[PDB]
Design an enzyme around this catalytic site. Structure first.
Site, mmCIF file in Angstrom:
data_model
loop_
_atom_site.group_PDB
_atom_site.id
_atom_site.type_symbol
_atom_site.label_atom_id
_atom_site.label_comp_id
_atom_site.label_asym_id
_atom_site.label_seq_id
_atom_site.Cartn_x
_atom_site.Cartn_y
_atom_site.Cartn_z
ATOM 1 N N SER A 200 0.857 -1.052 -0.111
ATOM 2 C CA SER A 200 0.087 0.020 -0.140
ATOM 3 C C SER A 200 0.998 1.323 -0.107
ATOM 4 O O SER A 200 1.741 1.406 -0.808
ATOM 5 C CB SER A 200 -0.874 0.055 1.233
ATOM 6 O OG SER A 200 -1.895 0.488 1.085
ATOM 7 N N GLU A 333 -8.946 -5.447 -4.530
ATOM 8 C CA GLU A 333 -8.036 -4.240 -3.668
ATOM 9 C C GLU A 333 -8.991 -3.459 -3.000
ATOM 10 O O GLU A 333 -8.691 -3.014 -1.802
ATOM 11 C CB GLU A 333 -7.334 -3.530 -4.643
ATOM 12 C CG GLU A 333 -6.409 -4.124 -5.217
ATOM 13 C CD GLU A 333 -4.833 -4.430 -4.303
ATOM 14 O OE1 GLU A 333 -4.990 -4.123 -3.187
ATOM 15 O OE2 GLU A 333 -3.850 -4.574 -4.759
ATOM 16 N N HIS A 446 -7.412 -6.025 -0.145
ATOM 17 C CA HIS A 446 -6.212 -5.581 0.147
ATOM 18 C C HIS A 446 -5.376 -5.832 1.402
ATOM 19 O O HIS A 446 -6.162 -6.074 2.406
ATOM 20 C CB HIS A 446 -6.583 -3.934 0.397
ATOM 21 C CG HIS A 446 -5.466 -2.925 0.354
ATOM 22 N ND1 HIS A 446 -4.607 -2.850 -0.594
ATOM 23 C CD2 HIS A 446 -5.156 -2.186 1.390
ATOM 24 C CE1 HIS A 446 -3.863 -1.814 -0.388
ATOM 25 N NE2 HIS A 446 -4.032 -1.271 0.900
#
Ligand SMILES: CC(C)(COP(=O)(O)OP(=O)(O)OC[C@H]1O[C@@H](n2cnc3c(N)ncnc32)[C@H](O)[C@@H]1OP(=O)(O)O)[C@H](O)C(=O)NCCC(=O)NCCS
Ligand SMILES: CC(C)(COP(=O)(O)OP(=O)(O)OC[C@H]1O[C@@H](n2cnc3c(N)ncnc32)[C@H](O)[C@@H]1OP(=O)(O)O)[C@H](O)C(=O)NCCC(=O)NCCS
Ligand SMILES: CC(C)(COP(=O)(O)OP(=O)(O)OC[C@H]1O[C@@H](n2cnc3c(N)ncnc32)[C@H](O)[C@@H]1OP(=O)(O)O)[C@H](O)C(=O)NCCC(=O)NCCS
Ligand SMILES: CC(=O)N[C@H]1[C@H]([C@H](O)[C@H](O)CO)O[C@@](O)(C(=O)O)C[C@@H]1O
Ligand SMILES: *[C@@H]1O[C@H](CO)[C@@H](O)[C@H](O)[C@H]1NC(C)=O
Ligand SMILES: *[C@@H]1O[C@H](CO)[C@@H](O)[C@H](O)[C@H]1NC(C)=O
Ligand SMILES: *[C@H]1O[C@H](CO)[C@@H](O)[C@H](O)[C@H]1NC(C)=O
Lengths: 531, 531, 531
Positions: A200, A333, A446
Site C-alpha cells: 500500500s 483491492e 487489500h
C-alpha cells in the site's frame, strides 16, 4: 547469553528467539534508532544522524509508533499483524527506529540478503512492530528489517516551497536505508544485496524511492505490493498551498507567509497537532461539499529534492533506478478493508447505476474522475448487466482498477521499457486470519498477501495445509528475488518475466502463469483520462 | 585607575581592593563568563565557549548563583562565607561565571601559582561569590579563582543514555579550567601551575577530575577537603533511569522515551524546574517508606564522557594522573551542620542501640548499609559502652566514617600506591565563626576548615588571636602545596608525606604529625561491605 | 444488608464492622459531606450547606484530605494513626467531609452521647481518616464523629479585613457541628449531648469554639488535649496584612488592594497554591534572618465573626457561656515529635546556656520571648545545673511549658473561675506504638495519649496488658465525661475537679490525683511576659 552487536554508533543488546523447525535461534533487535529524534526545531526538516552512545543499548522493547490517530492505528495493526497477539504500541514523535530479525549465527561471518520492509497505512498510520520478521528470516535465511518513518502532518506537511518542502517521511526511509548500508554487515547481512519491499503506502514508497536520486545506491531489488507512485490518492500534484493553509488555520496558525505557517506549526505540541489531525478527518470519505476539495491523506509531493518531477515525467525520461522490480496487486483491492477504513457509504449489495455515479463523484479524491466522465466510466463497468448485485461488485472492481490495477501495470511497463528486469503478480486468496467482520466472499482483499509474505501460518494458529504451503511458496519466491533479482527456483511454479509478452504470476491456491494483466483496463482508463 | 585586562574574548574591567599589611592592592574581577549561557536548547548539554565581546566588559558585580532552592542556598552561604557580610545573590540559569582575585602587579609580568576553588553544596546548592579570595591571594601571593557550575536538575539530570548523559556540572568545571589555562596568564597567573581545591561536593568534584581523562592537562595539584569520589551519596551507581522518570513525572512530563523526557524538560521554565526541585525535597532525610528509594541528591554518574567507569574501577586500574594530592577530613564531619541541614531526627541527644539501628536504616541513602548488616555496624560503634548520650556520639562518628573518613583514606592510599605524592590531614578546631546554634562541644564540624583556608580572620571582625595564627599557618600550607606540590615550609610544623607509614597532619590549636588515619575503621568497613 | 440512614439531605449507605469482643456491629459511614465543596468562588468564603442528593449516597470510601504538603501529611498520619496500617489519602480542595462510627442499633431509636473529634496538625496538615473511631465507639457505646476542615492557605488566609476575614477552617468546624445537630439523631446519637475533643491544633480549635458566639448551643462538653487558644503559635495577633502580602507575592499576585489579592488568589489552581505553600516553608524552624519575621503557620486570627477579640480578652470578660471542660497536657510536649517535625536544630546532645539562648531567640515564632528576656528565662530553667545534657532536657521543658503547660493551666483556671466544671490531667506514658526513631527515654511526648484515647491497643498489635488497661481506663474517663460532664465512674481512679485546690489527674502506668499543676511555672512566666 543474549546477542550483543557492535554498530557504528555503539553496542546493542538483542534477544534470541527460536522457531519450530530451525536449530539456529533468530537474533532479534527492537527499537534501534537510525536518526536523531525529530523533535522541536527538527520537526519538518530532513532526518539527522543518531548520536552515538556509550556502553550497551538495550534493544529488546518495541519502539513507539509515530504520532497518528491512536484508534485507527491500533485497528490497522490488529488487522495486519502476523503475530499471535497484537501488541499495543505507544504514540510518539520520537519514532525513527527499526527492528532487525537476523537468522545468521553472529559468531561467524555472514553476508545474507537483506529485506527492508516499509509498512503501509496511507502515510497517515502504521508501525513497523506490527510485522514480525521471525518466520521469514528463519524460513528463507534472510535478514529482515522493519522501519518506521514520520507520518501524517509530521511526515508530509508541505508549503510547496523551500520553507517546508515536504516528504519528510520518505527522507526518513532513505535515512534508514543509509543506516542499513553502514551497519547491516554487523548483523550478518550483505549491504550489497538490499531489497526494499512494502505494501500500500509502503508500496508507493518503494515506487518513489525507485524514482529518487537520493536512494541511488541504497537498494538492489524492489517489490511494491498493491501500491505505486501512480496511485494518485498518495501523490499530491499541482499547488499544495491550499492544504497547507487549511492545516495551519485548523491548528490556529496565521497564513501570512510559508515561513510563518511552518514556524507556528513547529511551536505546536504533539497533542495539538494530533487534535488538528482529528479535526481534519483524514482517511475518511467526506460525503459533504465539493468532492474535489477533500483531502483524505497528506502524502508525497514533488519537492525538488526527493522527486524532481512528477512520477509520470520521470518514467518518460526513463530516469530512475533500473534494479529488478516486482510489482503486484490483489484480486479485490477495494473489496472490504479500504472501504471499511474509510467509512465508504456502500451498504446494500445491490447498486443501480444512478447511485453508482453519485458514489463515484464523491470518490473523486480516490479516483479523480471528472464529473463529465463519470457516466462513461460507470456504463463501461456496470452497463453490461442489470443484476444490481453484480453491478455492485463491478463497481468495487472499477475503484480497484483506478487506484491500484492500472497504475501498477503502467509502472511495470515503463520499468520494463527502461531495460530493467520486471515481474508482476496478482494475488487471489482469502487468509483464515481475515477479520471476522469481513464476509467470506471477499478473496484477495487489500493486504491479504501479507499473511503469506510474513509467514503468519507459522506464528498464528488455525492455518490449513493449503495456506501453510502457500506461505512457504510466497516466502521462497520473495527471498529468491531478494538474492537473485529473479524469483524462480527449484520446486516452484515458473514465474515468467514481465516482458513484451506481459507474463505474470497468478498467486493463490492454484498458482500459474498468465499474460496481459489488466490490458483492456489500462487501455480504457488511459484513453478516458486523456479526454 | 581601575584594573583592565585583555582576555581571549575581550577586555575586562576590575577593581582594586587593599588589605592592610600589604601595599600592593589586589585586583578583583567579578562575574567573568567562561561559557555560553546554558539557556534553551543548551539546557542538559555540554558547555559551549563564551562569545567574544567588544569594548570593555565591567566585571564589578557578583554574578547570579545557579538555580537552586533559594532558602537553602542563602542559609549555606551565610554559614560558610568568610566575609564580614553575607552577600545575597540572585538565582539564574545564566550562572557560568568565575571570580578572580590576583595580588600580582599587572603592570609587570607575573606567573604566580593559581588556586581554583570548587564550592560544595551536595551538587544542589552553593555559589562562588560566597568565598572571597582577597585574604588568601594577598597573604600567600597566589591567584585565586572561584568558579560556578550547574547544580541540581540543571547540572546533573541524567536519563542514563545518550539523550542526557549527565554530569553537566562537572563538564562546566572542566570548561572553567580550560578557560583558566587560556586566560589566567593575563591576570598574572601561571597556567603551568594550577591547583584545584574544594570541599564536600567540591572535594568530590576535585576527586572526580583527578579520575577524568577530560582534565588530564588542566591542573597540576589537587586538594579534596571533606569529600571524594568514594563519598557514595554523591555518586550514582547502576540504573539511573528510575530517578530520571520520577523527576519527569513530577515536572508533569511523559516518560515514553528518554528523548521525550529531555525534550519536555527543556521546555519547562526555570521556575517550573525550581518548583519540581522543591517538590522532590532533595538534601533531606526522608523518614517515610523504603530508605533504599529515597534520593537526597542528583549527582555524578558514569556517563562515558567524564567517567568511563566507577571510581573504584578506575582506581584499581591506576588510570588517573599522578598529580600531588592533598586529601583531608574534619574531626566530626557529621557533628552538626549536615544533620541540621538534612533535618535529622535527634532532639533528645541520647540514643539506645535499637533506635540507632532504625536511624541507620533510614540513613541508607547516605551510608548504603544493607539492613542485614545494620546490627554488626551498630554493635561495632555503640556496643562498647552505655550512656545513650555517648552512643549517639559514636553514632555520628559511624556516619562520618562511612561518608568521609574511610572513603578519603581509601582514595589517598590508591593515589599513593600509584606513585603520586599524597598528603592527608585531620582538621580538629571549632571556629568562633560557627553558627550560634552550634554547641560549643562540636569541634571540627563539616566545613570548619574553610574559615582558616580562606582567611576569614582577616576579613571578618572578632576572630581570636588563636584563630588568626591557625589561618596564617593553614593558608601557608595550602599555598606551599600549590607552588611545590609539598605543603612543607620554613616556620611550619613538619607535614609527613602520606606513604607506607601513612603519616598525616592533625591540624588545630596544637598541630603535629601522626600516623595511620582511620586504619581500623577502613579495615572494618572494607570487610563489612565485602559481604 | 448494609446500613442505610436517612439524613436531611438524603439517604446514605455505610458498612457494618464488628470489633473483637463486641457482638453489636458498628455502622461506619465514610465521607459524608457536611458542606458544599469550597471550590472556585467559594474559596476563602464561609462554608455553605451541602446540596441534597437523590437515591442513596454510597459512603464507603475514605474522603480526600484537605490540600496540604503531601509528604508532611502522610508522615503525621503514620505517626498518629491508631489503625494497624496507615491509609494513604488523596489531596483535594473538596474535603469538607466527616466520618461516623455508631454502635447504636439503627433498627431501634437510640440517643447515645456524641463525641466529635477535631484533628491536629498545626492547622496546616492532618485528616480525619487518620483516626479510626471503631474501638472507642464499641467499647464506650458512644457515636464517634471525625471531621475535616480547610487547612493552611485554604483555611486561614486572611487580609485582615472584610475581603478575607480568615478562620475559614474554624467556620468549617462550626458547620460540621451544625450538621451533627441536625442529623446525628438518625445515626443513634443525641444532638442534645455533643462533646467536642481534639489534640494539638485540634485542641486549640476546641478552645476557640468554647470562646466563640458562633458555636454556642452546638456542643455541651469540651476536651482540649495538648493545645488551647493561648498556644500563641496558632493564634495570630496584630496586623496580618504583611503575611497576606508575602503569600500573594509568592503566588505571583499583585498587592494593590485586599480585594485584588484575594481575587487573584482565587484564580490560582490548587497546584499553584500548593506550590506557594511549599515555597513558604511552613511548619519549619526558620534559622535565617530575624526570628520575629518567621511564620511557620497560618492560623487563627481575630476576624470579628468567630472571635470578637483576643482569647486573652475573652477569658476575663467571662463571656464564653459555660460547659464542662477537660484540659490536659503530656509530660514532654516538646520531647521529640514536634522538634523532629519542625527540623529543630538539636543534632548534638548536651547544651550550653549560650547556645540555649541563641536557640530560644530563633524559636521566637513558637515561644514569643522578647530577646532582652531570653537570659532570665534561660537562667531560670538551666541555671540550676552544670550537666549540659540536663540543660538540654530542661530546655525542652521550657519550650513545652510556654507552648502548652502554662497556656493550658491559665485556660483551666479561667474556665474554673467562670463557674463551669473544669478538669485537668497530665499524661505520662510511652506508647509501644511510638516510632522506632523515637528514643526509649522519651515519655509522654506530644500525641502519646491519642493511642489510649482511640483504643490503639485494640486495633494495632503488640500492646501489653498494662497498655491495654490504660486505654480502657482513658476511653472510660473520656466517655463518662461525654455522658455526664464528669469523668468519674465505678472502678476508676478518683479524678478530682479542678477547683481552688487545683486537683488534676496524673495518667500513666500508675494513675492517681495530685494538685497544683505547673503552679510555679505559671507564676514565673506570667511575671516574665508582664515586663
Ligand atoms: C480508518 C483508517 C483509514 C484510519 O483513519 P484515521 O487516521 O483515524 O482518520 P479518520 O478521518 O478515518 O478518522 C475516523 C473517525 O471515525 C470514527 N470511527 C468509527 N469506527 C471506525 C472504524 N471502524 N475505522 C475507522 N475509524 C472509525 C473514529 O471516531 C475516528 O476518530 P478519531 O480520530 O477520534 O480516532 C485505517 O484504520 C488505516 O489504519 N488503515 C490503512 C489504510 C491504508 O491501507 N490506505 C491506503 C490508501 S487507501
Ligand atoms: C538543607 C540543605 C541540604 C539544603 O536543602 P534543599 O536544597 O533546600 O532541599 P530540602 O529538601 O532539604 O528542603 C527542606 C525544606 O525544609 C524546611 N527546613 C526547615 N529547617 C531547615 C533547615 N535548618 N535547613 C534547611 N531547610 C529547612 C524548609 O521549608 C525547606 O523548604 P524549601 O524547599 O521551600 O526551601 C543545606 O542548606 C545545604 O545548603 N548545605 C550544604 C550541604 C552539603 O554540605 N552536603 C553535601 C553532602 S552531605
Ligand atoms: C513536619 C510537619 C510540621 C509538616 O511540615 P510541612 O507542611 O511539610 O512544612 P515543612 O516546612 O515542615 O517542610 C519540611 C521539609 O523538610 C524535609 N524533611 C526531612 N526530614 C523531615 C522530618 N522528619 N519531618 C518533617 N520534614 C522533614 C522535607 O523535604 C520537607 O519537604 P516538603 O515541604 O517538600 O514536604 C509535620 O509532619 C506535621 O504533619 N505534624 C503535626 C505537627 C503539629 O502537631 N504541631 C503543632 C504545633 S507546631
Ligand atoms: C469515587 C468518588 O468519586 N469518590 C467519592 C466516593 C464514591 O461515592 C464511592 O467511591 C463510590 O464511587 O464516596 C463519596 O461519594 C462519599 O463517601 O460520599 C465521596 C468520595 O469523594
Ligand atoms: C532490557 O530491557 C528489557 C525490557 O525492558 C528488560 O526486561 C531487561 O531486563 C533489560 N536488560 C537489561 C538488564 O539491560
Ligand atoms: C458502594 O461503594 C463501594 C466502594 O468500595 C463499591 O464496592 C460498591 O459496589 C458500591 N455499591 C454499593 C452501595 O454496594
Ligand atoms: C560598571 O558597573 C559598575 C557597577 O555599578 C560601576 O561601578 C562601574 O563604574 C561601571 N563601569 C564604568 C566605569 O562605567
Amino acid at each position: 547469553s543474549p546477542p550483543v552487536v557492535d554498530t557504528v554508533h555503539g553496542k546493542v543488546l538483542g534477544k534470541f528467539v527460536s522457531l519450530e523447525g530451525f536449530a539456529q535461534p533468530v537474533a532479534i533487535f527492537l527499537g534501534i534508532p537510525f536518526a536523531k529524534p525529530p523533535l522541536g526545531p527538527l520537526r519538518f526538516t530532513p532526518p539527522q544522524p543518531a548520536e552515538p552512545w556509550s556502553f550497551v543499548k538495550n534493544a529488546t522493547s518495541y519502539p513507539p509508533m509515530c504520532t497518528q490517530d491512536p484508534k485507527a492505528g491500533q485497528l490497522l495493526s490488529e488487522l495486519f499483524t502476523n503475530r499471535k497477539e497484537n501488541i499495543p504500541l505507544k504514540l510518539s514523535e520520537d519514532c525513527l527506529y527499526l527492528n532487525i530479525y537476523t537468522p545468521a549465527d553472529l559468531t561467524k561471518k555472514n553476508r545474507l540478503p537483506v529485506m527492508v520492509w516499509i509498512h503501509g497505512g496511507g502515510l497517515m498510520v502504521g508501525a513497523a512492530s506490527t510485522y514480525d520478521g521471525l518466520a521469514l528470516a528463519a524460513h528463507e535465511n534472510v535478514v529482515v528489517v522493519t522501519i518506521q518513518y514520520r507520518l501524517g502532518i509530521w511526515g508530509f506537511f508541505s508549503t510547496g516551497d523551500e520553507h517546508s518542502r515536504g516528504n519528510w517521511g520518505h527522507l526518513d526511509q532513505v535515512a534508514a536505508l543509509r543506516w542499513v548500508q553502514d551497519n547491516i554487515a554487523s548483523f550478518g547481512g550483505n549491504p550489497g544485496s538490499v531489497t526494499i519491499f512494502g505494501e500500500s503506502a509502503g508500496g508507493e514508497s518503494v515506487s518513489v524511492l525507485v524514482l529518487s536520486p537520493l536512494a541511488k545506491n541504497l537498494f538492489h531489488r524492489a517489490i511494491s505490493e498493491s501500491g505505486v507512485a501512480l496511485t494518485s490518492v498518495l501523490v499530491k500534484k499541482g499547488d499544495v498551498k491550499p492544504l497547507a493553509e487549511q492545516i495551519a488555520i485548523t491548528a490556529g496558525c496565521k497564513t501570512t507567509t510559508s515561513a510563518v505557517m511552518v514556524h507556528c506549526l513547529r511551536q505546536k505540541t504533539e497533542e495539538e497537532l494530533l487534535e488538528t489531525t482529528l479535526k481534519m478527518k483524514f482517511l475518511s470519505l467526506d460525503l459533504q461539499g465539493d468532492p474535489r476539495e477533500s483531502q483524505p491523506l497528506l502524502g508525497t509531493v514533488i519537492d525538488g529534492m526527493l522527486l524532481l518531477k512528477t512520477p509520470e515525467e520521470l518514467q518518460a525520461e526513463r530516469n530512475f533506478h533500473t534494479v529488478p522490480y516486482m510489482v503486484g496487486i490483489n484480486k479485490q483491492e477495494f473489496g472490504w478493508l479500504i472501504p471499511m477504513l474509510m467509512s465508504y457509504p456502500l451498504s446494500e449489495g445491490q447498486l443501480d447505476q444512478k447511485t453508482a455515479m453519485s458514489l463515484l463523484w464523491k470518490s473523486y479524491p480516490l479516483v479523480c474522475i471528472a464529473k463529465e466522465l463519470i457516466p462513461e466510466a460507470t456504463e463501461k463497468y456496470l452497463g453490461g448487466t442489470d443484476d444490481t448485485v453484480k453491478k455492485k461488485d463491478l463497481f468495487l472492481d472499477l475503484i480497484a482498477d483506478v487506484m491500484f490495477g492500472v497504475p501498477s501495470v503502467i509502472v511495470a511497463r515503463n520499468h520494463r521499457d527502461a531495460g530493467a528486469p520486471t515481474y508482476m503478480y496478482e494475488f487471489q486468496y482469502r487468509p483464515s486470519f481475515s477479520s471476522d467482520m469481513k464476509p467470506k466472499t471477499v478473496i484477495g482483499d487489500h493486504g491479504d498477501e501479507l499473511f503469506s509474505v510474513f509467514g503468519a501460518p507459522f506464528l498464528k494458529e488455525g492455518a490449513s495445509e493449503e495456506e501453510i504451503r502457500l506461505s512457504k511458496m510466497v516466502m521462497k519466491f520473495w527471498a529468491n528475488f531478494a538474492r537473485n533479482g529473479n524469483p524462480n527456483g527449484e520446486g516452484l511454479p515458473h514465474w515468467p518475466e514481465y516482458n513484451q509478452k506481459e507474463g505474470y504470476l497468478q498467486i493463490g491456491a492454484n498458482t500459474q502463469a498468465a499474460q496481459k494483466l489488466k490490458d483492456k483496463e489500462v487501455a480504457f482508463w488511459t484513453n478516458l483520462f486523456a479526454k
